[PDB]
Structures are given as C-alpha cells and as structure tokens.
RNA sequence: UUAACCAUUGAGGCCUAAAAGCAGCCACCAAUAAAGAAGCGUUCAAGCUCAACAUAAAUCAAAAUUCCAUAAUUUA
C-alpha cells in the first residue's frame, strides 16, 4: 500500500484520534528464540532456552506417555 | 433416535478349479421389520453396531456348489426410514413383513467367469426414528417453548436462559380429560436463516419434519429483541420464521401449524399484544406469501395464564386432521 | 463456618515453623472465600511468648493450641473435626 | 525334576579322582 | 474471568450482577481492522493497544513502522521494559501471517 | 517344546553351576563411600553473585513472609510497590544461607524462613512499606534490616515513626 | 515424645524417652541392626528386637523413624507379622473400638506363618511325589540368615 | 535421518540355521535401539508386516529412522506353502535410531518383540554392551572349579557317552534352539 | 471386575492393593477400571 | 523413586466467523527471580491444570469312582 509505507503507517495509532498520525530517528535508535551454542552458560537466557530444551525434553518424553 | 449401523456383506467363496463350480453368493443385509420396541434393544442392547453376514462357502471336490452363504437381519421399529450415509433415504420400513435389501451379499465366485473371487459390499447405513410426535415446537431462542411444555406435562424441561440451549428436543405427551395423550416435542431456539446450516443448523429440523403439525411460540418480550443488533420484532420473527421454514422445506409450510403467544403477563406486553393483534391479519407497515394459521392464543407461561384455553385449541385442531 | 480465626506467634524466634505454615495454608485465599464468614488475622511480637492459634466460633466454642508440640497437619486435622461439630 | 544331593556330591568325588589321575598321568 | 481476545447478549451476567456502544465508540478509538485484546475483565472494563496480526498485514512491516507501534504497547503487557513488548510483537510478528 | 536329558547329561548341568561371590561385608551397612567431588551449576554461581549484588546495592532488607500468590496477583502488588519504587527478591535461600552464615548479618537466619519473600529498596520508607502491608490484611511481616540495623516488626514499626 | 491432650483447648507436651544404650559394639554401622552385628542373627521369635519398631497397637514405625536400611525394614516387618500371628505380643493388640469385642473364637496355635490365614485356600489336590503341592512355612526374606543345620532349612513342607 | 526413514516393504515370494549362537547382525550399525532375539525361531511374513506396521505409524519421520536386519524370507516350506526367515538367538532383528532416547522407543520395540515367534527383548547400545560385560564377569568370578568344557573336553567322567558333538562347542550354553543366559 | 493375567493402572486415580490373597486395581472415579489378577 | 506443591501475552498465525499451549496446517512463540506449552479443555477462549520457579528425600536366580505315605523350618 503506497501510504502506508510512507509516514501514513499502521504502526502509529490509526484511531479516530490517531488516523495514521517514518524516520529513524523520530524512534528509538538503540532499538534499531535464540541458539543455545551462542548462550553462555551462567547467562539468563542460556537457561531459559536450555530449559525450555529441557521442558521439551520433558515434554519429548511427556509427549508420548 | 437417530443412530447409525454398519454392516458388511458376506464374501464370495472361491471355486474349485476343473469343473469345480460355482461359490456361493455371499451373505447379504437384510433389515427385518418387527415389533416398533426393537429400536430401543438395537441401539442399547448389541452395542457392536456392525451387522456382518457369512461369506459363501467355497466350492468343493464333487462340484459342489456354495452354501449360498449365510444372511444377517436387522430388526427395526415399525415406520422406521432406511437412509444412506450420504442421508439419501433407501426406504422405509413403514407396515410390517418389509425387509430390505440394505447390503449386497458378495457376488458367489465362479472360476468360469471373469472373477474367481469377490469381495461383499460393506456400508454405513443410517437407521433413525426422528421424533413423530403429533406436533412440535418451533420458535427462536429464549421464546419460552421449555417453560409452556413444562406446565402442560411434567417433564422437568431444561429452560434455555441463553441461545444454543436445549439442543435435544424434548417429548412431552400431554394427557386429557378424553384419556387422549397427544406428543408435543421442544426444540431448542433457531437462528434466522440457517439454510446454510449456521449455529445450530437444520440438521435437528429434520425432527419437526417427522411431527406432523407446527407449533409456534411467539414471545412477547422477543419483539424488538436487539440481539447484536438485529431488533427482530415479533411481526419480523414471524416473517423471518415463515421465510427461513420455506427455504428448508416448501412441504413444512404447508404442513398445518398452530400460534402461541408468550409472555403476555406484563402491562406493556398486553399493549404489544394488542400490536400482536395488529401485526399480521390486516396489512401492516411492511419492512414471500407467507402462511397465517390464525390458531393463535394469547397466554403467558411464567403466570400460567390462559394455557388451559390453548389446550383445547389444540387437540380440535388434531382431531380434525 | 467459621466465625474467626486468629493466629499469633513471635518472627524471630526460631522456635516453631509448623504455627507458619499453618498461617501460609490460611493465608491461600481459596478456602479464605469458602468460609467467608471469617475475617483472618495475623500478629506478630517480640516477647517470650510460645507461638498459639485462637479459633472463635458463634456458639462461643474456643479452640486454641500452640505450635511448639504441633505439627501443622494435626492443628488443621484437630480444625477440620472441630468444624463438623 | 532335581537332581539329588546324594548324587551331585558324589560326582564331584569322582571329578576330583579323575582329576589327580591327570596329573600322575603327565610326568 | 477477562474475555481477552485478539452488549447484554454479550454480557448477561452484568445484568444480574455499556460495553456495546463503547465497543463502537471504542472502535472509533481503535483501527477499524485491526484486532484488539479485549480487556474486559470479570467487572472492571478498559481496553489499550491493539494487536500486531493485522498490522503486519495492512504493511512487510520495516524497524521504524514497528517501533512506533511499540510506543502504543508502552501506552499501556504492562512489564516496564519496553524493548521486552518489542520482542513480544515481534515474536508474535513471525508466527502471524 | 522341551526334551527330556538323560538324568546324567542332567546331573552334569547340576554341578555345573555358576557360583557368585560372596562378600563378608555388605558395601550397604559399610561406612558410605567418601562423596563424589559436586560441582555448581553457572546458575548458582549467578544466584550467589545476584544475592551479593542485591545486599550491596540495597541498604535495608527485610523479611516479609510469602504467600505464593497468583504471578498475576502477584505482579499487581508489585505493581503498587513498583510505584513506590520498593523492589520484591525471591531467591533459593540454600544458597542465601552461606552468605547469613559469615557475612555482616547473621542473625537473620532466624528471620529467613523458607518461604518467605524479600524486601529491597534505596530508601527507608518504612511507614509505607508498612502501608504496603496493609494493603494485604493477613500478609505478616516477620523482621528483618533497615538502614543495616536488624530490628524486629514491633521494632520496625517504632521505628516507622 | 509427644502427647496431644484434649480440655475446647488441646496442647501437645512433650516428655523424655529412654535413649539408645551407649557404646555400640560395632560403630560406624550405617544401619541400626548393622551397628549391634544383627544382619543374619534374628528370627520372628526375638520380640525384644521387635517390639522396640512396633507402635502400642502392634503397627510398624516408619522406616525414617527407625533408620532401618530397605532390606532389614523388610525382615524386620515380616517378622513382626509372623510374631503377631504366633501370639508372641499380646499386649500390641488393635484398638478394637468399644462397640466391638474379639471373635471370640478359641485360636489355634500358630508359628513361621507366611501369609495371612485369612486368605489361603485349601489344598484339595495334594499331588503325588514328584508333584507334591507344597506347603510354605516361613518367609523367603529370611533365607540368609545363619543356618546351624547339615543343609538349608525346608521352606516347603 | 535418512530419507526412508519408514520400515520398507518385504517381498512374500523371492534344523541347525536356529540351533546355535548367531554370527550375524550381532551389532549395532547405524541405530542407537534395536530388538535382540533371546532364541531360535522362524520369522514369517506376518510377523514382518507386524513390525512394518506398527513401528512406522509411531516413528516420527523429523526425528526417528528404521532399517530391517534380517533378509526376506527364503526358505521353502511344504505340508511351497510359503518362506520362513531364519533367526538365530543373539541376531538384531530390526534397528532404530535418531535424536531419541532409548525410553522413548522402549515401550514400541517391547510391544513389537513379544508378538515376535520367538523370545526377544528391546536394546540399545549401553544394554548390549552391559549384557556381555556381564557375561564375561561371571565367566571371570566363578566360584565353581568345574565348568562344562573342561568336563567335556577332557572327558571326564565318560560323559562324552552322553553327549552330542556340538555340545562341546556349545559348551551347555545353548540346548536346542533355546538359549540359556545364566548358564555360564 | 474383570480377572485377566496382568494388571495395569488405566488412569491417575486408579490404585493397587493387596486383598485376600490376589491383587487389584480399584478406581473410585470410573469403575470400569476394575481388574483382578 | 512422587513427596505436595504451582501454572505470568500480543486468540501465534492460516482454511472452516476467528481458531487461545492447543479445529486444521506452519512458525515452534512474550518480558520477566520464573513458564513450552504436557495431558487435556475448548464452537475457538470455557481452562480442570504437567514441567519450571519456589521446597524436603529418592533387573533377576524355587475334567470326569476317592485327596493320596505319614510328618518336618536348625545339635556341630
Ligand atoms: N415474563 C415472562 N417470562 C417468561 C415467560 N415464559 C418464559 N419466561 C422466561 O423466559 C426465560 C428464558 O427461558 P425460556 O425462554 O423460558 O426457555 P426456552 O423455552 O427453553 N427457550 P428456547 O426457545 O431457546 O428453547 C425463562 O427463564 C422464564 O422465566 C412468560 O410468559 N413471561
Ligand atoms: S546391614 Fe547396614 S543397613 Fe542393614
Ligand atoms: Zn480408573
């Protein structure tokens, strides 16, 4: 759609208010699952992933009963 | 009361090379009309409901021919309609000594012709008793159809407070003075249209088909029902009824009906039905022929107002046809 | 069925879990709502004193126990036949 | 069907006789 | 109870004990299209963001037209961080469509 | 099927027989053997560095007792307590413990109990933390440290005046 | 031990139980039966072993409680069953509620009972020689205990 | 995995074959779990559509794979009424593998074993290797002085009067087309 | 009860027990789990 | 080896209005001290609640005439 591509986009609130209200800078520019074998051990998201292996492996096992 | 059978028919025994012979035929299906209280022993009682039949047996030294293999029946209540899977109607066991044919025993192999062996014909085949009950209850969702046949009788009906309830209809038989009991079944309330089969659907309109008159609840409280925002009217339900009731079927209009007001106790609802008066009968501010029986009363079920009148209305109505 | 329920044991005194647990237990909020009648409280102190529990019921029956000798099931068991009455 | 006390030990006897006449038998 | 999903039919319990016309009115206040997660709760009522399933697919959608929506989920998924409700969409993002 | 054995072929199986050794000693009643070297998962590793961390950025911790309520529930009191800016720590106390048993506080063992959630802030607003308890009616509070002096409810609540 | 009493006010009080005699003869035993050298050396005849893991009504304790190892738990409880139906303990009797009363039948003598009287069925059919149908006495879990017998004890009669 | 990770189909037309110990298909090639055969018997058709049936409906084509260890019936059968393939206590009749655990496919391969026409149990690799490594253990430890082969061999006893040729190979471990585990 | 060669549990809620000399499963919820050995 | 506990969204989309861990198929998903969706529920979401957090311990070897020696667990 060729408005919506422009500064016309769905993302800004296309309320009534709103009506479609773009440029990087006018959004955060810091802003701008994963692999277990990246992830490190002690690091949080390691065990999130490695655990939901692990609950899929619970589950892999659970799964089947 | 509408179940389903499956049945297999028995397979052709194999011929007997060099002048051998013929097999028998295999056994086939025959549904066997009896006393009407079998259906309650077929459905319950034999649970498998795989009817299979003995295959022919095989041809033998000396050239015998086969047995002509062994048949297998199926006893079914009296006005019973024989249907396909697919729902096309076979036949009917409407009087008794009707057998029929439901599945094809396997054809007797012959080693002379084409097919040394065959294989019998197995099937699904739909057995059902839908509801013959002398009339039965049409009306839209929270009409108060359960709450009138649960005064008449003593049935304990489920009260439908919501939409899509009281799937099951339920058969009420109504006792008289006469000794005269007359079936009246609920169903529960239908959504307009539905000859797309939406929401609930016609399937269970097959029941009322079966019934051999209609009876209409029309709920006061109903007119300007805003729903998501539909605000059907009483005089709208009606049309839409008529309307929805022909597309189904063209006979079910035409079949004899009768009109029952509901929820006529309030003050407000006995203004509205004097506009019940006025709504239908004489022309009215119109929003195809459509059908008025005029059997209508007015009576209120929560009060229990007026339905000894409704009574008799009825059952002259029956007695005339 | 229960008029009131009150609990009473002094924190640091590492003298009786069992009073504790059995104040967690109350404190699930799922039987709290089935007996609605009873408002639950928790108080705590510094004294000396054994950690007890005081149930109050509108017959005027009173049952109180300490936790010191009681295991958290047997309080709850002793409860729950009290309750029947 | 076991096979007796009487007859398992009685064997053995005769497996250890047997036994030394294979050493006497090889010098 | 809330009915979360991406008026007295719709809420006969509230008349044992509104939302039909605040529905409208609210779908004024949000995207006519874009579906919402109706926080009507079970009786407290509110409503805030809508949700990423149609957005993707009226846009496919580039880093700053998804950022930008990010700030209406910061508008009112409550956790503070805001970079965690950027992978949420966005983990939502992929599996959508 | 089976076939019968001549009762000579049979006695040869008969004496033939595997024969286990025994011990004099069962290894169960023995002394158990010395323990197998454990290791600690990086997980723990990390949970004893985050209780460090958590006592030295926060100046005041107190005990108040958990009551396992619904995450969501849950997330709404933390919700209040976020506006006031007071943080909730959980944390497997079995590793808590080495810490209470040499660090500068250990006294607070008794205090720490199981199940028993944390409390953790920059700034003393004890009166309101009280306020916060309030909000919970049967939610106690069993003591704990403020401004790195341990004190008990009936202490800490003179001391929130 | 611990005594819950009833006044409605009820408190548990505790009062001091006789402790172990000290100086086992062989210490460092895991086990309390390893510790004293009982492994192999006790029957369903010594009541003053068992009676010390027998609750006042005849029950066993917990094997938690005692400390016993899983396989001496075993022995020690079967024997218990087998001294209760030998009318070794009869001060460990049920707590028969006080509406009911003994059978009051005359009771047979009984010893080295393997199962329940209650429940074995007669053998009506016997067999011959070598297909005897055999009669168990005594329990399996005890074939190593020592033997001062020429050969092994005849479990089957 | 392999592509044909599904059991393929087995064509039904192309004393001593089951009375000793197997030479053949005796480890694993490919696959983590596979059925060993405890004794000597005759596999038929039916007993391989059995096992094509039921294990390729459980087996998960992204994460499990089968392959047969047995030829397809060959030997002739008269009242040539049908094949017969030959087994011999010890063999591998069907191998499985993947990014599974053994537990996983325990319960199939057991179920799968026991309408087996002889005696079989389901093993992965470590079972196979503790199996002979405790076999060798209580070859080593054997409190007995008197062994099978030694008696045979030396003809101790005038046994060998007794005795079939093949026993002293056998060395009493297999009688028949049964094997006898313990039997050291 | 159905007295068949081996036992299994058909559900969480059945349970096992040893009476008068042979075992059974018993479910309070469905009694159709029933078997004796 | 179960102990008695606890279960946090944009409905992930699309083919069945729309399909919620979950009609069906494919992604195989969301922050967090901590949770992927396991049974299953659900028109679909009702949600009964598994695994987490958060707590404490944890494979085998002796049918038909009328039952049919008697008995017996330890003395070297
Ligand atoms: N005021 C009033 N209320 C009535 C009357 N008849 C029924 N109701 C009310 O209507 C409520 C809704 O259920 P109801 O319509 O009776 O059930 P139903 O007949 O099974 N409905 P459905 O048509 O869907 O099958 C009932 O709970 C009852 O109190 C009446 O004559 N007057
Ligand atoms: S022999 Fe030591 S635990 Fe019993
Ligand atoms: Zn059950």
Same mark, same amino acid.
């Given at each position: 759609?060729?408005?919506?591509?422009?500064?016309?986009?769905?993302?800004?609130?296309?309320?009534?208010?709103?009506?479609?209200?773009?440029?990087?800078?006018?959004?955060?520019?810091?802003?701008?699952?994963?692999?277990?074998?990246?992830?490190?051990?002690?690091?949080?998201?390691?065990?999130?992933?490695?655990?939901?292996?692990?609950?899929?492996?619970?589950?892999?096992?659970?799964?089947?009963? | 009361?509408?179940?389903?059978?499956?049945?297999?028919?028995?397979?052709?025994?194999?011929?007997?090379?060099?002048?051998?012979?013929?097999?028998?035929?295999?056994?086939?299906?025959?549904?066997?009309?009896?006393?009407?209280?079998?259906?309650?022993?077929?459905?319950?009682?034999?649970?498998?409901?795989?009817?299979?039949?003995?295959?022919?047996?095989?041809?033998?030294?000396?050239?015998?021919?086969?047995?002509?293999?062994?048949?297998?029946?199926?006893?079914?209540?009296?006005?019973?309609?024989?249907?396909?899977?697919?729902?096309?109607?076979?036949?009917?066991?409407?009087?008794?000594?009707?057998?029929?044919?439901?599945?094809?025993?396997?054809?007797?192999?012959?080693?002379?012709?084409?097919?040394?062996?065959?294989?019998?014909?197995?099937?699904?085949?739909?057995?059902?008793?839908?509801?013959?009950?002398?009339?039965?209850?049409?009306?839209?969702?929270?009409?108060?159809?359960?709450?009138?046949?649960?005064?008449?009788?003593? /049935?304990?009906?489920?009260?439908?407070?919501?939409?899509? #309830?009281?799937?099951?209809?339920?058969?009420?038989?109504?006792?008289?003075?006469?000794?005269?009991?007359?079936?009246?079944?609920?169903?529960?309330?239908?959504?307009?249209?539905?000859?797309?089969?939406?929401?609930?659907?016609?399937?269970?309109?097959?029941?009322?088909?079966? #019934?051999?008159?209609?009876?209409?609840?029309?709920?006061?409280?109903?007119?300007?029902?805003?729903?998501?925002?539909?605000?059907?009217?009483?005089?709208?339900?009606?049309?839409?009824?008529?309307?929805?009731?022909?597309?189904?079927?063209?006979?079910?209009?035409?079949?004899?009906?009768?009109?029952?007001?509901?929820?006529?106790?309030?003050?407000?609802?006995?203004?509205?039905?004097?506009?019940?008066?006025?709504?239908?009968?004489?022309?009215?501010?119109?929003?195809?022929?459509?059908?008025?029986?005029?059997?209508?009363?007015?009576?209120?079920?929560?009060?229990?107002?007026?339905?000894?009148?409704?009574?008799?209305?009825?059952?002259?109505?029956?007695?005339?046809? | 069925?229960?008029?009131?329920?009150?609990?009473?044991?002094?924190?640091?005194?590492?003298?009786?879990?069992?009073?504790?647990?059995?104040?967690?237990?109350?404190?699930?909020?799922?039987?709290?709502?089935?007996?609605?009648?009873?408002?639950?409280?928790?108080?705590?102190?510094?004294?000396?004193?054994?950690?007890?529990?005081?149930?109050?019921?509108?017959?005027?029956?009173?049952?109180?126990?300490?936790?010191?000798?009681?295991?958290?099931?047997?309080?709850?068991?002793?409860?729950?036949?009290?309750?029947?009455? | 069907?076991?096979?007796?006390?009487?007859?398992?030990?009685?064997?053995?006897?005769?497996?250890?006789?047997?036994?030394?006449?294979?050493?006497?038998?090889?010098? | 109870?809330?009915?979360?999903?991406?008026?007295?039919?719709?809420?006969?319990?509230?008349?044992?004990?509104?939302?039909?016309?605040?529905?409208?009115?609210?779908?004024?206040?949000?995207?006519?299209?874009?579906?919402?997660?109706?926080?009507?709760?079970?009786?407290?009522?509110?409503?805030?963001?809508?949700?990423?399933?149609?957005?993707?697919?009226?846009?496919?959608?580039?880093?700053?037209?998804?950022?930008?929506?990010?700030?209406?989920?910061?508008?009112?998924?409550?956790?503070?961080?805001?970079?965690?409700?950027?992978?949420?969409?966005?983990?939502?993002?992929?599996?959508?469509? | 099927?089976?076939?019968?054995?001549?009762?000579?072929?049979?006695?040869?199986?008969?004496?033939?027989?595997?024969?286990?050794?025994?011990?004099?000693?069962?290894?169960?009643?023995?002394?158990?053997?010395?323990?197998?070297?454990?290791?600690?998962?990086?997980?723990?590793?990390?949970?004893?560095?985050?209780?460090?961390?958590?006592?030295?950025?926060?100046?005041?911790?107190?005990?108040?007792?958990?009551?396992?309520?619904?995450?969501?529930?849950?997330?709404?009191?933390?919700?209040?307590?976020?506006?006031?800016?007071?943080?909730?720590?959980?944390?497997?106390?079995?590793?808590?413990?080495?810490?209470?048993?040499?660090?500068?506080?250990?006294?607070?063992?008794?205090?720490?109990?199981?199940?028993?959630?944390?409390?953790?802030?920059?700034?003393?607003?004890?009166?309101?933390?009280?306020?916060?308890?309030?909000?919970?009616?049967?939610?106690?509070?069993?003591?704990?440290?403020?401004?790195?002096?341990?004190?008990?409810?009936?202490?800490?609540?003179?001391? /929130?005046? | 031990?611990?005594?819950?009493?009833?006044?409605?006010?009820?408190?548990?009080?505790?009062?001091?139980?006789?402790?172990?005699?000290?100086?086992?003869?062989?210490?460092?035993?895991?086990?309390?039966?390893?510790?004293?050298?009982?492994?192999?050396?006790?029957?369903?005849?010594?009541?003053?072993?068992?009676?010390?893991?027998?609750?006042?009504?005849?029950?066993?304790?917990?094997?938690?409680?005692?400390?016993?190892?899983?396989?001496?738990?075993?022995?020690?409880?079967?024997?218990?069953?087998?001294?209760?139906?030998?009318?070794?303990?009869?001060?460990?009797?049920?707590?028969?509620?006080?509406?009911?009363?003994?059978?009051?039948?005359?009771?047979?003598?009984?010893?080295?009972?393997?199962?329940?009287?209650?429940?074995?069925?007669?053998?009506?059919?016997?067999?011959?020689?070598?297909?005897?149908?055999?009669?168990?006495?005594?329990?399996?879990?005890?074939?190593?205990?020592?033997?001062?017998?020429?050969?092994?004890?005849?479990?089957?009669? | 995995?392999?592509?044909?990770?599904?059991?393929?189909?087995?064509?039904?037309?192309?004393?001593?074959?089951?009375?000793?110990?197997?030479?053949?298909?005796?480890?694993?090639?490919?696959?983590?779990?596979?059925?060993?055969?405890?004794?000597?018997?005759?596999?038929?058709?039916?007993?391989?559509?059995?096992?094509?049936?039921?294990?390729?409906?459980?087996?998960?084509?992204?994460?499990?794979?089968?392959?047969?260890?047995?030829?397809?019936?060959?030997?002739?059968?008269?009242?040539?009424?049908?094949?017969?393939?030959?087994?011999?206590?010890?063999?591998?009749?069907?191998?499985?593998?993947?990014?599974?655990?053994?537990?996983?496919?325990?319960?199939?391969?057991?179920?799968?074993?026991?309408?087996?026409?002889?005696?079989?149990?389901?093993?992965?690799?470590?079972?196979?290797?503790?199996?002979?490594?405790?076999?060798?253990?209580?070859?080593?430890?054997?409190?007995?002085?008197?062994?099978?082969?030694?008696?045979?061999?030396?003809?101790?006893?005038?046994?060998?009067?007794?005795?079939?040729?093949?026993?002293?190979?056998?060395?009493?471990?297999?009688?028949?087309?049964?094997?006898?585990?313990?039997?050291? | 009860?159905?007295?068949?060669?081996?036992?299994?549990?058909?559900?969480?809620?059945?349970?096992?027990?040893?009476?008068?000399?042979?075992?059974?499963?018993?479910?309070? #919820?469905?009694?159709?789990?029933?078997?004796?050995?």
């Amino acid at each position: 759609d060729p408005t919506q591509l422009t500064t016309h986009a769905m993302g800004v609130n296309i309320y009534k208010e709103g009506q479609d209200v773009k440029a990087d800078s006018e959004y955060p520019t810091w802003l701008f699952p994963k692999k277990l074998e990246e992830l490190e051990p002690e690091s949080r998201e390691y065990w999130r992933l490695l655990r939901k292996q692990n609950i899929w492996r619970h589950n892999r096992l659970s799964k089947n009963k | 009361d509408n179940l389903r059978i499956f049945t297999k028919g028995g397979s052709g025994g194999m011929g007997y090379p060099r002048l051998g012979g013929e097999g028998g035929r295999g056994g086939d299906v025959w549904v066997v009309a009896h006393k009407n209280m079998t259906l309650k022993q077929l459905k319950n009682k034999y649970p498998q409901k795989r009817f299979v039949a003995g295959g022919g047996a095989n041809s033998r030294v000396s050239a015998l021919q086969g047995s002509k293999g062994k048949d297998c029946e199926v006893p079914a209540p009296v006005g019973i309609s024989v249907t396909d899977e697919n729902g096309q109607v076979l036949g009917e066991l409407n009087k008794e000594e009707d057998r029929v044919l439901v599945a094809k025993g396997g054809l007797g192999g012959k080693l002379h012709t084409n097919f040394l062996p065959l294989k019998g014909q197995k099937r699904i085949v739909h057995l059902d008793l839908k509801v013959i009950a002398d009339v039965g209850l049409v009306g839209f969702p929270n009409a108060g159809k359960s709450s009138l046949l649960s005064r008449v009788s003593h /049935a304990t009906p489920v009260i439908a407070d919501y939409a899509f #309830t009281t799937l099951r209809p339920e058969l009420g038989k109504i006792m008289y003075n006469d000794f005269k009991q007359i079936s009246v079944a609920d169903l529960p309330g239908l959504i307009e249209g539905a000859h797309m089969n939406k929401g609930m659907g016609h399937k269970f309109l097959k029941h009322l088909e079966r #019934t051999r008159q209609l009876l209409f609840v029309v709920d006061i409280s109903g007119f300007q029902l805003s729903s998501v925002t539909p605000y059907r009217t009483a005089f709208e339900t009606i049309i839409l009824l008529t309307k929805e009731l022909e597309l189904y079927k063209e006979e079910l209009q035409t079949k004899p009906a009768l009109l029952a007001i509901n929820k006529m106790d309030l003050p407000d609802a006995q203004v509205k039905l004097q506009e019940l008066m006025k709504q239908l009968l004489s022309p009215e501010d119109f929003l195809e022929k459509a059908l008025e029986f005029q059997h209508i009363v007015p009576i209120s079920t929560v009060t229990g107002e007026g339905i000894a009148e409704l009574k008799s209305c009825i059952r002259k109505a029956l007695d005339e046809q | 069925p229960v008029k009131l329920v009150r609990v009473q044991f002094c924190p640091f005194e590492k003298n009786v879990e069992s009073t504790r647990t059995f104040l967690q237990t109350v404190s699930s909020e799922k039987v709290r709502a089935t007996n609605l009648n009873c408002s639950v409280i928790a108080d705590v102190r510094h004294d000396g004193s054994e950690p007890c529990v005081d149930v109050l019921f509108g017959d005027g029956y009173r049952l109180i126990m300490r936790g010191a000798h009681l295991t958290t099931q047997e309080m709850l068991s002793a409860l729950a036949s009290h309750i029947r009455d | 069907r076991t096979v007796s006390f009487q007859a398992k030990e009685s064997m053995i006897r005769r497996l250890e006789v047997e036994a030394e006449n294979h050493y006497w038998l090889s010098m | 109870g809330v009915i979360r999903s991406i008026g007295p039919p719709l809420g006969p319990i509230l008349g044992q004990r509104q939302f039909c016309k605040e529905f409208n009115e609210k779908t004024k206040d949000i995207k006519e299209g874009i579906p919402l997660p109706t926080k009507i709760f079970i009786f407290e009522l509110k409503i805030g963001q809508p949700t990423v399933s149609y957005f993707l697919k009226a846009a496919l959608v580039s880093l700053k037209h998804v950022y930008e929506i990010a700030c209406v989920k910061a508008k009112d998924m409550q956790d503070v961080p805001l970079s965690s409700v950027v992978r949420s969409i966005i983990g939502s993002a992929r599996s959508l469509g | 099927h089976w076939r019968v054995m001549h009762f000579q072929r049979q006695k040869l199986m008969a004496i033939t027989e595997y024969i286990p050794p025994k011990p004099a000693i069962n290894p169960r009643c023995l002394p158990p053997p010395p323990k197998p070297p454990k290791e600690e998962s990086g997980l723990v590793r990390l949970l004893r560095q985050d209780i460090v961390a958590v006592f030295r950025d926060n100046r005041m911790i107190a005990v108040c007792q958990n009551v396992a309520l619904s995450a969501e529930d849950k997330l709404l009191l933390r919700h209040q307590l976020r506006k006031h800016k007071i943080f909730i720590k959980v944390f497997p106390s079995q590793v808590l413990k080495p810490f209470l048993e040499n660090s500068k506080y250990r006294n607070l063992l008794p205090l720490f109990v199981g199940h028993n959630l944390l409390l953790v802030s920059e700034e003393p607003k004890v009166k309101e933390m009280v306020r916060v308890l309030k909000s919970v009616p049967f939610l106690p509070l069993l003591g704990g440290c403020v401004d790195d002096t341990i004190l008990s409810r009936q202490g800490l609540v003179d001391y /929130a005046k | 031990l611990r005594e819950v009493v009833k006044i409605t006010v009820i408190e548990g009080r505790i009062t001091e139980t006789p402790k172990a005699t000290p100086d086992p003869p062989n210490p460092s035993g895991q086990c309390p039966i390893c510790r004293w050298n009982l492994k192999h050396k006790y029957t369903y005849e010594d009541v003053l072993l068992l009676s010390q893991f027998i609750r006042p009504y005849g029950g066993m304790l917990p094997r938690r409680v005692t400390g016993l190892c899983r396989e001496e738990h075993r022995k020690i409880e079967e024997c218990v069953k087998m001294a209760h139906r030998a009318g070794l303990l009869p001060n460990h009797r049920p707590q028969l509620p006080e509406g009911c009363l003994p059978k009051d039948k005359p009771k047979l003598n009984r010893y080295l009972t393997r199962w329940a009287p209650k429940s074995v069925k007669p053998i009506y059919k016997k067999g011959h020689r070598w297909n005897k149908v055999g009669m168990a006495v005594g329990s399996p879990l005890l074939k190593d205990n020592v033997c001062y017998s020429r050969r092994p004890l005849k479990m089957m009669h | 995995i392999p592509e044909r990770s599904k059991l393929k189909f087995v064509e039904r037309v192309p004393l001593k074959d089951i009375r000793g110990p197997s030479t053949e298909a005796t480890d694993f090639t490919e696959g983590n779990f596979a059925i060993l055969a405890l004794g000597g018997g005759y596999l038929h058709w039916g007993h391989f559509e059995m096992m094509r049936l039921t294990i390729n409906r459980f087996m998960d084509p992204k994460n499990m794979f089968a392959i047969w260890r047995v030829p397809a019936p060959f030997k002739p059968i008269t009242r040539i009424d049908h094949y017969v393939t030959p087994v011999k206590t010890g063999c591998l009749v069907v191998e499985m593998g993947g990014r599974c655990e053994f537990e996983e496919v325990k319960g199939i391969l057991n179920q799968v074993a026991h309408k087996l026409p002889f005696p079989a149990k389901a093993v992965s690799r470590k079972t196979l290797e503790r199996m002979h490594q405790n076999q060798r253990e209580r070859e080593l430890n054997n409190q007995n002085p008197w062994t099978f082969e030694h008696i045979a061999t030396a003809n101790m006893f005038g046994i060998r009067k007794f005795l079939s040729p093949y026993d002293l190979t056998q060395k009493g471990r297999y009688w028949g087309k049964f094997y006898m585990p313990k039997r050291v | 009860f159905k007295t068949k060669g081996v036992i299994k549990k058909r559900c969480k809620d059945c349970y096992k027990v040893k009476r008068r000399g042979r075992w059974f499963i018993l479910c309070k #919820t469905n009694p159709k789990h029933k078997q004796r050995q």
